[PDB]
Ligand binder design. Structure first.
Ligand SMILES: Nc1ncnc2c1ncn2[C@@H]1O[C@H](COP(=O)(O)OP(=O)(O)OP(=O)(O)O)[C@@H](O)[C@H]1O
Ligand SMILES: [Ca+2]
Ligand SMILES: [Ca+2]
Lengths: 125, 350
């Protein structure tokens, strides 16, 4: 079986930006009103989908690690990244993003730039 | 249903439940049978009446009957879990032959009747526990050391290096060099004591030749250890000469390349376009990577060997002794794990 998940079924269908937070060993949508603000206590998975001129879709997967996130969260973010790439037939390029050292590509996804906030969802461990 | 996670080490088994941050059970990978069978700590307490055997050699299961005794002990005496009622995640060494994987699978489904199982490569689990999908893991345990390049989640099989130099060789080398000061540690019991001395007092020199110089100039090198019998032993330059063998295997009469050279060689086997990401993500795993000073020393040595355009970063997670098991705990906790395993019914009808 191709490994799937309801969020997997929604991923990469249209050009745009999709952000999930790791919560208790699961991949949970971030409310769109919060896009660009990241909890320092958490880990996130971000899929940027681009419609190329040929019609085809290009995928970049980024996993963002907060300075205070727990090991379950960073480990799950990495694994979910692999799984979502596999779901996309391996055609995503994967990128690790650490708080305060993110790529200019990742920063550029957010018109207001990247911002951080104290707190986060409880660890699953 | 909560999965059980079992890391099958040459030296110790690590076992517990998915979702824990550390294994609840850690015990020696030893089976004793009379001179029916005893496993782990109990086997060592009855070593006087038992012949002791290690069923896992260099990370590979090589005595299947005794390995089944270890797994029985794990489920029934350590965890008190019905194996037939839990999914199980089992680990395997890099480069484990598919035939060995099939044999373990057969035993789990047909001896233990596990309902579902997943087999994971140890080094991959460790990379995940570090929060990475790309890097090169240096996993040095009791019986084997491997360097395992991983790209976007998956090991690159053609680039993995196996090194038959690990912690038990280092314990034996400390036993040997302690004869210089008149100690004669030789029995299996004495070996466990020397293992503890190694873990408590050893360290890796930043520059070996300079450390030899400085340690000769005073007694500041000397540290003391209380033996079980109450006598105190004093160890000097043995403290850093012992793990130096990781870098200089000739110290053990081995012609093998050292861990820095091996890591370099492993990266070189990968195509040029991904090497930067490997050099920048050298992740240490396993008990034999626990020596103070290892990261700084590896960084110097790998920087020397690698092209000077590369950016060398050695990562030394604090809980790296357990990183394989922890990665298994995380993986087996995910919402998607149930789609990854093989079920007993599927296996039985293959
Ligand atoms: N703090 C320490 N310093 C040095 N060596 C250590 C330390 N802690 C454990 N070790 C050594 O690490 C080894 C055990 O490592 P580990 O548990 O990773 O191996 P394993 O999984 O049983 O074996 P393998 O992976 O080789 O099959 C032993 O040789 C032990 O003495
Ligand atoms: Ca959190
Ligand atoms: Ca990919």
């Amino acid at each position: 079986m191709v490994v799937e998940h309801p969020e997997f079924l929604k991923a990469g269908k249209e050009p745009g930006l999709q952000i999930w937070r790791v919560e208790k060993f699961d991949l949970v949508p971030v409310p769109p009103n919060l896009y660009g603000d990241f909890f320092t206590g958490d880990a996130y998975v971000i899929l940027k989908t681009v419609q190329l001129r040929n019609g085809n879709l290009q995928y970049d997967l980024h996993y963002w690690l907060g300075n205070e996130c727990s090991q379950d969260e960073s480990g799950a973010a990495a694994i979910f990244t692999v799984q979502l790439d596999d779901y996309l037939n391996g055609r995503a390029v994967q990128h690790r993003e650490v708080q305060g050292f993110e790529s200019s590509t990742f920063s550029g996804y957010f018109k207001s730039g990247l911002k951080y906030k104290k707190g986060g969802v409880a660890s699953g461990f | 249903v909560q999965a059980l996670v079992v890391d099958n080490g040459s030296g110790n088994v690590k076992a517990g439940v998915a979702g824990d941050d550390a294994p609840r059970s850690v015990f020696p990978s030893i089976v004793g049978r009379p001179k029916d069978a005893f496993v782990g700590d109990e086997a060592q307490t009855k070593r006087g009446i038992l012949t002791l055997k290690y069923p896992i050699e260099h990370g590979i299961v090589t005595n299947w009957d005794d390995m089944e005794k270890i797994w029985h002990h794990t489920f029934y005496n350590e965890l008190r879990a019905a194996p037939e009622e839990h999914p199980v995640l089992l680990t395997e060494a890099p480069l484990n032959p598919k035939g060995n994987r099939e044999r373990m699978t057969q035993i789990m489904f047909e001896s233990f009747n596990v309902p579902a199982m997943y087999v994971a490569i140890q080094a991959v689990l460790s990379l995940y526990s570090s929060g990475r999908t790309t890097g090169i893991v240096l996993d040095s345990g009791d019986g084997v050391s491997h360097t395992v390049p991983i790209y976007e989640g998956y090991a690159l099989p053609h680039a993995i290096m196996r090194l038959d130099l690990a912690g038990r060789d280092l314990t034996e080398y400390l036993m040997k060099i302690l004869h210089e000061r008149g100690y004669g540690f030789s029995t299996s019991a004495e070996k466990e004591i020397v293992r503890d001395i190694k873990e408590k007092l050893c360290y890796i020199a930043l520059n070996f030749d300079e450390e030899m110089k400085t340690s000769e100039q005073s007694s500041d090198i000397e540290k003391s250890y209380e033996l079980p019998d109450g006598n105190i032993i004093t160890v000097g330059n043995e403290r850093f000469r012992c793990p130096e063998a990781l870098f200089q295997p000739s110290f053990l009469g081995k012609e093998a390349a050292g861990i820095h050279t091996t890591t370099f060689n492993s990266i070189k086997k990968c195509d040029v376009d991904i090497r930067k990401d490997l050099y920048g993500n050298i992740v240490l795993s396993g008990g034999t990577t626990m020596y103070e000073g290892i990261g700084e020393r590896l960084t110097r040595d790998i920087t020397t060997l690698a092209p000077s355009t590369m950016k060398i970063k050695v990562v030394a997670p604090p809980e790296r002794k357990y990183s394989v098991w922890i990665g298994g705990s995380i993986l087996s906790s995910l919402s998607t794990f149930q789609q990854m395993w093989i079920t007993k019914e599927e296996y039985d009808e293959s």
